């Protein structure tokens, strides 16, 4: 009859909270050399298992833009980047006034590099010696009070920190697993129509998450996850102009980038064994520096973007214009392959429109027609604000290639008006947080509160 109070231990109640995660990796990545890659010296092996568990009913409200885990990844990657450059340091010259002349080669000349005569210290701090290396044009500035074309200075020395990366490390995006310590659990929303926030219902539980790839990337995102069935377009305000929109594609569109041969990497020693490498001569001829993209895949992929984007807009058109100027770090697409850095121009990708008149291009009469882009190669990398973004990259041995599986776009809508039925999208950059937010939106971590109280007819015997 009468009711008393009973306490239960083991009650499944979830609450929102902030915490940290566990870094782990597959076993084949721990038998390699130290800091090749950082995971080998940094993380702990784990099992990619168990089996994902789907819940009976439950209703949950995720939110892509309210998640600490994404910023946590940003802090971890920036922190480890700074820690990777502490035991590998250069402080020596490479800032002395550089006297330069038009770069020549055994078979002709080159316009994008300069051959610069040096003035360095020998291994003994008593003497200076003559030397030469070749550099890319955008990394050298003519520091002068007048038009003195024979006095140049290494761009990076305007501020500092000329340090050099180790010739025994690689930045291949080894996949990382995020596990949670005991007392917490990870929830994964499986609703493929999930439109950014609110009641998920296919909610599964996981003890440790899926792989993620720490790829540094700008406007076009390279290797990553795939969509389920069709194109997905995420956004925050839409109305507001200062926001970034995420486009997830069900393609992937093949893309390949490459460069020509170079002779080798001159090994120059400064003072007490501070070896560094520099781009030497080039044999034989000299070419670009370009990227290739299949046209017919690009065409229908970019059109399918239109048919799904028009879901939010009545009878208004989609247009594509170049990015809002600025220096190359803003307008040109930057990515890394094989230790080299390229900055490419994407004019031939985003020029056109869609007005609802969809035209499937058929048949596949000639698949040889492709799109080609120009690229540039830098060596001073200014990656992240506050990470010691001051790396001087070395060159590598010969001609290298890179093949990638492009999965998504980062776009922003222009702030046009005056009867703007031709709304245009610009390519826009942003923080690396936004890329990882696009990868990590499925996952959330909650606290377990195992104690609970409920009324009952039970009573303790005296």
């Amino acid at each position: 009859e009468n009711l008393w109070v009973t306490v239960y231990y083991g009650v499944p109640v979830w609450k929102e909270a902030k915490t940290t995660l566990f870094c782990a990796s597959d076993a084949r990545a721990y038998e390699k050399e130290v800091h090749n890659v950082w995971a080998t010296h940094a993380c702990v092996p784990t099992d990619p298992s168990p089996q994902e568990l789907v819940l009976g009913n439950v209703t949950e409200n995720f939110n892509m833009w309210k998640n600490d885990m994404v910023d946590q990844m940003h802090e971890d990657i920036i922190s480890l980047w700074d820690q990777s450059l502490k035991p590998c340091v250069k402080l020596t010259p490479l800032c002395v006034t550089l006297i330069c002349s038009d770069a020549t080669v055994k078979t002709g000349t080159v316009e994008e590099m300069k051959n610069c005569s040096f003035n360095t210290t020998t291994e003994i701090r008593d003497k200076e010696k003559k030397e030469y290396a070749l550099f890319y044009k955008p990394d050298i500035v003519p520091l002068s009070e007048t038009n003195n074309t024979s006095e140049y200075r290494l761009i990076n020395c305007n501020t500092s920190c000329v340090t050099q990366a180790c010739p025994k490390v690689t930045f291949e995006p080894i996949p990382i697993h995020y596990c949670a310590p005991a007392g917490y659990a990870i929830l994964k929303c499986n609703d493929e129509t999930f439109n950014g926030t609110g009641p998920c219902s296919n909610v599964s539980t996981v003890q440790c998450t899926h792989g993620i790839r720490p790829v540094v990337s700008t406007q076009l995102l390279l290797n990553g996850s795939l969509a389920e069935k069709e194109i997905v377009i995420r956004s925050e305000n839409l109305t507001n102009n200062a926001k970034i929109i995420i486009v997830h594609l069900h393609t992937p569109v093949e893309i390949v980038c490459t460069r020509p041969n170079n002779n080798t990497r001159k090994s120059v020693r400064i003072g007490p064994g501070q070896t560094f490498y520099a781009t030497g001569d080039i044999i034989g001829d000299i070419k670009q520096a370009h990227c290739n993209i299949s046209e017919e895949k690009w065409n229908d992929t970019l059109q399918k973007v239109g048919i799904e984007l028009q879901k939010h807009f009545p009878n208004k058109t989609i247009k594509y214009n170049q990015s809002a100027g600025g220096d190359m770090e803003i307008t040109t697409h930057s990515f890394n392959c094989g230790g080299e850095f390229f900055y490419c121009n994407t004019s031939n990708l985003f020029n056109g429109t869609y007005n609802g008149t969809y035209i499937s291009t058929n048949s596949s009469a000639n698949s040889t027609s492709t799109i080609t882009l120009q690229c540039r190669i830098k060596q001073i990398i200014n990656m992240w604000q506050g990470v010691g973004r001051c790396m001087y990259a070395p060159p590598i041995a010969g001609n290298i290639t890179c093949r990638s599986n492009i999965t998504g776009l980062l776009l922003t809508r222009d702030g046009g008006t005056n009867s703007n039925e031709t709304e245009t999208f610009r390519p826009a950059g942003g923080d690396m947080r936004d890329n990882w937010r696009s990868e990590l939106y499925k996952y959330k971590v909650v606290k377990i509160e195992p104690l609970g109280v409920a009324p009952t007819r039970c009573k303790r015997r005296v």
């Binding site: 109640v13 659990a185 539980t205 009573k459």
Partner: protein, 131 residues
């Protein structure tokens, strides 16, 4: 409430079912609670995970109970917190939304339970000294 058997999923395997349907399986469920400068965060997680467990254990140990699964007491339930039918809550609701209703009066209940425990222990001393 014990037909799963193969439990490596913790409390989360029973979520969404009725509170009556989860009265058992609490054994394996509870077990899941305990099973460079980077070492600092790796360590800190282990220590705070322990600190959370013991404080929850104190609450059970303070007001006199063992057999962590289910503990009944002698404090009468004050209907002013819910004024609802027992069977309606016990069979229709799962633990999820139940928490969101009783989470306001938890501190009141903890206080009464502590007072009750002291009353009983002293009562035992009088009945002990009789023999």
């Amino acid at each position: 409430a014990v037909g799963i058997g193969a439990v490596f999923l913790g409390f989360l395997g029973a979520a969404g079912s009725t509170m009556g349907a989860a009265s058992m399986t609490l054994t394996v469920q509870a077990r899941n609670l305990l099973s460079t400068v980077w070492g600092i965060k790796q360590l800190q997680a282990r220590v705070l995970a322990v600190e959370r467990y013991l404080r929850d254990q104190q609450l059970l140990g303070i007001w006199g109970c063992s057999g962590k699964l289910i503990c009944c007491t002698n404090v009468p339930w004050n209907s002013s917190w819910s004024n609802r039918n027992l069977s309606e809550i016990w069979d229709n609701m799962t633990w999820l939304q139940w928490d969101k209703e009783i989470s306001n009066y938890t501190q009141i209940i903890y206080g009464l339970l502590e007072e009750s425990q002291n009353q009983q222990e002293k009562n035992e001393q009088d009945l002990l000294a009789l023999d």
